[PDB]
Amino acid sequence: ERSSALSEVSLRLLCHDDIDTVKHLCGDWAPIEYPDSWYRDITSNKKFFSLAATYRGAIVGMIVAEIKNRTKIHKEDGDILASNFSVDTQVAYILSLGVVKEFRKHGIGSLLLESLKDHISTTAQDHCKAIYLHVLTTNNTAINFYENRDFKQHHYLPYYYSIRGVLKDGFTYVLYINGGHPPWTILDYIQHLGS
Amino acid sequence: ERSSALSEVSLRLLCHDDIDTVKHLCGDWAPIEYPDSWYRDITSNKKFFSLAATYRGAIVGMIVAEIKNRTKIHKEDGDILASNFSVDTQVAYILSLGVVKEFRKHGIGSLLLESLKDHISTTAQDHCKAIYLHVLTTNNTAINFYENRDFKQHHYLPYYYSIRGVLKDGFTYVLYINGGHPPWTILDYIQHLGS
Numbered sequence: 001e002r003s004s005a006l007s008e009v010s011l012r013l014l015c016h017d018d019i020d021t022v023k024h025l026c027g028d029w030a031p032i033e034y035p036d037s038w039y040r041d042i043t044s045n046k047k048f049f050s051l052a053a054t055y056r057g058a059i060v061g062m063i064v065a066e067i068k069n070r071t072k073i074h075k076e077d078g079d080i081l082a083s084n085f086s087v088d089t090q091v092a093y094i095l096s097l098g099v100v101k102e103f104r105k106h107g108i109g110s111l112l113l114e115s116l117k118d119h120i121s122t123t124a125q126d127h128c129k130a131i132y133l134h135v136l137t138t139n140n141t142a143i144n145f146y147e148n149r150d151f152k153q154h155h156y157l158p159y160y161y162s163i164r165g166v167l168k169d170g171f172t173y174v175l176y177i178n179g180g181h182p183p184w185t186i187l188d189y190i191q192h193l194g195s
Numbered sequence: 196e197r198s199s200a201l202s203e204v205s206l207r208l209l210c211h212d213d214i215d216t217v218k219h220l221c222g223d224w225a226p227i228e229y230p231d232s233w234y235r236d237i238t239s240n241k242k243f244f245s246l247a248a249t250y251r252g253a254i255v256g257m258i259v260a261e262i263k264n265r266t267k268i269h270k271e272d273g274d275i276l277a278s279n280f281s282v283d284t285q286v287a288y289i290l291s292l293g294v295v296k297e298f299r300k301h302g303i304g305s306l307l308l309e310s311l312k313d314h315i316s317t318t319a320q321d322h323c324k325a326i327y328l329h330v331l332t333t334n335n336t337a338i339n340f341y342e343n344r345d346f347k348q349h350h351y352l353p354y355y356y357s358i359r360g361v362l363k364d365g366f367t368y369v370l371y372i373n374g375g376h377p378p379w380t381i382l383d384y385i386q387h388l389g390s
């Protein structure tokens with residue numbers, strides 16, 4: 001019944017009319033409260049690649065990502081790429097990837113991820129050197145899914161408490177593409193040169 | 196009546212019994228929701244310098260700060276101190292400074308700040324090289340107070356949106372002490388050497 005689901009799946013861009021659905025879906029995935037303006041931006045702004053997967057015409061999954069130059073990476077994650085990659089270097093940040101619970105394990109998430117990769121390849125060619133994202137420490141399912149897909153856990157991000165707000169702890173996961181890699185230690189060089 | 200307030204002010208450490216009061220006061224200053232554990236930590240943990248100002252025995256202001264090694268600074272603020280200051284270098288982060296609205300402009304805030312400076316001087320001597328804090332962009336009163344007190348606006352901190360949570364925008368303000376300074380550009384060196 002459901003298991004036929006991929007056969008009935010289509011892909012389309014998110015749009016403004018989807019905002020209520022997106023809030024509901026995002027809300028199911030995590031408890032965070034994004035502002036209305038955020039939802040408006042991801043749905044409508046071309047700067048983001050926002051792609052929905054629909055089952056029988058209804059959204060059951062989405063991926064939202066931004067392709068950006070390396071200088072746009074937040075300092076917490078500044079060390080994902082080695083210094084020898086130029087400021088012109090690009091990365092893709094996955095703001096959100098999610099699939100409705102009933103529809104998981106049907107390949108929808110994989111399809112969304114692959115579509116992003118295809119988009120990057122077309123759009124940025126070899127210039128984009130990494131895809132990175134944040135996951136909550138608690139998301140076993142997500143972590144397993146990314147790890148199986150060659151993402152590496154770059155580092156732990158601690159709880160953040162400030163007058164500005166509060167952040168839960170998390171991990172940064174990175175998939176390197178087109179020769180991208182993290183900064184190398186003396187030992188890393190020693191091995192490459194040494195052998 | 197109120198104007199006599201400083202004459203009736205005393206200073207004491209925060210303690211566990213203060214948690215409800217602290218929540219109420221902090222809540223008045225800003226809308227952020229810290230967890231109970233945070234309040235428990237600032238009130239009870241010696242790692243923090245948490246000092247209250249009381250008027251007629253009731254808390255009307257507080258300062259909470261942590262003296263820490265430079266490696267403990269978050270990456271967003273990693274560039275507050277120049278690289279030539281050693282990893283052994285210390286800084287103080289002001290988690291909170293606040294005074295009840297009725298009691299403002301009586302010198303309580305200044306007193307709290309000064310007490311922190313005295314504490315740093317006693318505790319860390321010349322080893323601590325900066326005091327830094329975060330302010331919301333909207334806090335005109337706070338900004339004026341710090342600026343008048345020789346704090347400098349180091350940089351803007353943008354809104355942060357992620358699965359981990361949401362942060363409002365802000366500024367990092369820094370007061371340099373004991374010869375501390377930010378990283379120097381080529382031009383900075385050119386001037387020092389040049390003239």
Ligand SMILES: CC(C)(COP(=O)(O)OP(=O)(O)OC[C@H]1O[C@@H](n2cnc3c(N)ncnc32)[C@H](O)[C@@H]1OP(=O)(O)O)[C@@H](O)C(=O)NCCC(=O)NCCS
Nearest residue numbers: 029096097098099104105106107108109110141142145148
């Ligand atoms: C991570 C996540 C997106 C995975 O999506 P999916 O579940 O749509 O992903 P897929 O179905 O492609 O892959 C999941 C597993 O099902 C397996 N699978 C694929 N097709 C299958 C099928 N037809 N029958 C049985 N299993 C199948 C896949 O092999 C994969 O297993 P593997 O990792 O061992 O290879 C999903 O777990 C999720 O939405 N988690 C929550 C993420 C979140 O919190 N997002 C917040 C954003 S606001």
Ligand SMILES: CC(C)(COP(=O)(O)OP(=O)(O)OC[C@H]1O[C@@H](n2cnc3c(N)ncnc32)[C@H](O)[C@@H]1OP(=O)(O)O)[C@@H](O)C(=O)NCCC(=O)NCCS
Nearest residue numbers: 224291292293294299300301302303304305336337340343
């Ligand atoms: C910033 C803040 C702490 C200042 O405290 P105060 O108001 O207790 O500080 P002071 O009274 O020492 O100084 C304020 C002004 O009053 C002046 N003042 C001092 N004594 C005065 C007096 N007796 N009569 C009139 N003015 C006086 C001071 O000169 C100072 O002016 P200046 O900056 O021009 O020198 C207060 O504005 C505040 O609590 N803001 C909110 C901060 C916040 O949001 N914190 C969140 C933490 S969770």
